Amino acid sequence: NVGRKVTVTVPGSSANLGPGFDTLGLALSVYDTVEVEIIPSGLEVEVFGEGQGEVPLDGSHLVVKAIRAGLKAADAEVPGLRVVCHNNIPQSRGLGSSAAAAVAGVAAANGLADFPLTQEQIVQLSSAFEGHPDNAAASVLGGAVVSWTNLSIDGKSQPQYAAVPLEVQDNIRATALVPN
Amino acid sequence: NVGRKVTVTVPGSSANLGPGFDTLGLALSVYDTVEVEIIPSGLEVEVFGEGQGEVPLDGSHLVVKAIRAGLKAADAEVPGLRVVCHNNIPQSRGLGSSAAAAVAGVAAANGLADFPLTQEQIVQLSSAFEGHPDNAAASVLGGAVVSWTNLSIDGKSQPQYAAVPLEVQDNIRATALVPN
Amino acid sequence: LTSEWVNRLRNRGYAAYLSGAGPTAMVLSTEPIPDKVLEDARESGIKVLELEVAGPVKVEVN
Amino acid sequence: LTSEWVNRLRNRGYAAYLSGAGPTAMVLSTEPIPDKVLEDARESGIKVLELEVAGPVKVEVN
Amino acid sequence: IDARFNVSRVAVMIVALQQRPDLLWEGTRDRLHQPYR
Amino acid sequence: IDARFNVSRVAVMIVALQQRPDLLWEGTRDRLHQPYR
């Protein structure tokens, strides 16, 4: 595994936050793209678009962290990574940018390792980065999702994130008013 | 309109009560039956099955009251009624017996008057008898319903009851443990 | 609230809940509840109704 | 929480809500929002995104 | 007991998205003008 | 702010009835063993 390259495209998402135990997140047609090639070694990181120049470029970056978490979940290892991000999802605007990043990282690792992870596995891992599944589940599954957190271990608490897909009518449209 | 006779069959229902604004009611395959014939005049009332001997038999009876409310909503009038009820829905057991009675009464009146009332009209009228739509909406629409109450008038409060039908999977079964 | 039957049924995997005001416990499932569970409760006094999801109110003109 | 744009959009019939932590207001509809509403907000500084419901994350191997 | 103005409407949201887009406004009506008991 | 043990699960109930009967138990899980904040 050297020279292997995957390309991940991940939607932003929107959740109406409330007092309810169950939260609905809606995946939306604004995307971040992460290109990940396995290089001879080291770690090369680039971020263009949203966050450009604003973010440190190394193993500190959320996406890289997600990849390394994903590679571990996939029970795999790389000699080095070139991680190039092109972001179109506005950051810190309630559009699920950080969730999308985590998802993209795990999904990328999953693709590098020839897809050993289940969908729930990717929801569980990506949600753990934020500690909640609200946006992450929507970025993984697409469409509208209902998610919640079971505090069910033994070994408590160990949050178990669950998410179920709804099918949305074809004619439903989303318009975001994003302040500067 | 003398000698006209309708026969109404109404399901019981079950709602899981909670702190939520929206309530789900499920219509269940245990039924009350009301036979209503337009007689020369007076009011004759019979109740067999559940409630038999337990209930006064006159214009005090919930079903008769519902019919007279329904006839008014249908903007109609009768010279007299023979109301015969055969009840199979356990009473005061959480199975929506009173709601079913109100529904059956309005539905009966609607049938006598050749069906001028809309489905929402019957939900609105039957729910007003209890002051909530939880069971009544399920008895009117069948299947699973989600209902809620909008306090929206002018002229406040005037509760407006709304209900929407869900379609349930064919294999879903209900078992009631009904205490004596 | 909470009924004794609800919890004992839930602690064994059955999707049980109190029906409206109660005291009836309702179980939803895709498979019937084992007779031994039903007959156990029957001897404490409970009447068991095995029901389906019903259709809307029916009016027929005679 | 509550955003000024949410209420002004709701008080005119649009299904608006605060998206996650905000400050973005999201409107769901089957018909587009009148340009005059959009261009009005654009001149206060808001960037308007006309979006669809998206599919799942996509991974492609190159 | 306790009265409140902020309620969750995810239930109606679900129905509005899947089959009743005319309910989208209701499915996002998270704040009531009369308290819910 | 406020923590609670009793929550509504009508949202999950809806999904369980329409397409996921394996979620019926969760859709009726109205009482939590850990408080919801």
Of C20, C46, C50, the CB nearest to B135: C20
Per the structure, the complete domain to which residue C16 belongs is given by 1-62
Q: Dihedral of the CA atoms E35, F3, F5, F9 (nearest 10)? A: 60
Q: Tell whether C50 lies on the interface with B, counting CB pairs under 8 A.
A: yes
Count of helices and strands (H, E) across chain F: 2, 2
Known binding residues of A are 90-100
Amino acid identity, position A62: L
Range(s) of the domain holding residue B25 = 1-180
CA atoms within 13 A on the CB side of A121: 15
CA distance B124 to B159: 9
Inter-axis angle of helices A97-112 and A62-73, to 10 degrees?
40
Measured between CA atoms, how close is D10 to chain A, in angstroms?
A: 13
Identify the experimental approach.
X-ray
Chain B residue with CA closest to C27: the answer is B175
Query: How many contacts (CB atoms, under 8 Å) link A and E?
Result: 41
Q: Do F34 and A151 touch (CB under 8 A)?
A: yes
Angstrom distance (rounded) from CA F10 to CA E22: 20
Q: Are B70 and B110 in contact (CB under 8 A)?
A: yes
* CA–CA min distance E22, chain D (Å): 8
Chain D residue numbers touching A123 (CB-CB < 8 A):
none
Distance CA B22, CA A11 (A): 30
What are the chain F neighbours of A131 within 8 Å (beta carbons)?
A: none
Residues of chain B contacting C28 with CB distance shorter than 8 Å: 26, 172-174
Nearest CB neighbour to C28, from listed F24, F30, F31: F24
Contact F28 C30 (CB under 8 A): no
Q: What is the signed CA dihedral for B179, C4, C7, C11, rounded to 10 degrees? A: -100
| CB-based contact A151 F32, cutoff 8 Å | yes
CA distances from B41 to B6, B65, B66, B98, F34 (A): 17, 16, 18, 26, 63
Extract the tokens encoding A79: 């000699």
Q: How many domains is chain A built from?
A: 1
> Where is F27: in which H helix or E strand?
helix F24-27
* D15 part of contact set with chain E, CB < 8 Å: yes
**Nearest Cβ partner of D16 from E21, E28, E31?**
E28
Q: Sheet containing A173-178: give its strands across.
A: D15-18, D25-29, A173-178, D47-52
- Residue ranges for the known binding site of B for ATP are 90-100
B140, C56 contact by CB (below 8 A) = yes
Number of H helices, E strands in chain C: 2, 4
Q: Measure Cα distances from D30 to A177, B115, D57, E21, E30 in Å.
A: 17, 33, 24, 7, 20
Helices marked H in chain A — which ranges? Answer: 62-73, 97-112, 119-130, 136-141
Q: Are strands A144-151 and A23-38 parallel, antiparallel or unpaired?
A: antiparallel
Give the N- to C-terminal CA distance of chain E in Å, as an integer. 7
CB A3 within 8 A of CB A38: yes
Q: Name the closest residue on chain B to residue E11, using Cα atoms.
A: B22
Question: What does the domain layout of chain E look like in residue ranges?
Answer: 4-31
The span from the CA of A31 to the CA of A17, in Å, is 22
Q: Does D33 lie at the interface with E, CB-CB under 8 angstroms?
A: no
Residues of F in contact with B16 (CB under 8 A): 10, 13, 28, 30
Token digits of residue A145: 């999702």
DSSP annotation string for A19-34 = S-SSEEEEEEEEEEEE
| Per-residue buried b or exposed e for C22-59, using 16+ beta carbons within 10 Å of the residue's own CB | bbbbbbbbeeebeeebbeebeeeebebbebebbebbbb
Query: What span, in angstroms and rounded, lies between the C-alpha atoms of A144 and A25?
Result: 6
Element (H, E) at B136: helix B136-141
Neighbours of B48 (CB within 10 A): 13
Q: Do chains D and F touch (3 or more CB pairs under 8 A)?
A: no
Phi, psi of D36 (to 5 degrees): -65, -35
Query: Given the structure tokens 């309630």, which residue do they identify?
Result: A94
Q: Tell me, yes or no, if A82 comes closer than 8 A to chain D by beta carbon.
A: no
Q: Which residue of E has its CA nearest to D28?
A: E24
Chains touching B, CB cut-off 8 Å, 3+ pairs: C, E, F
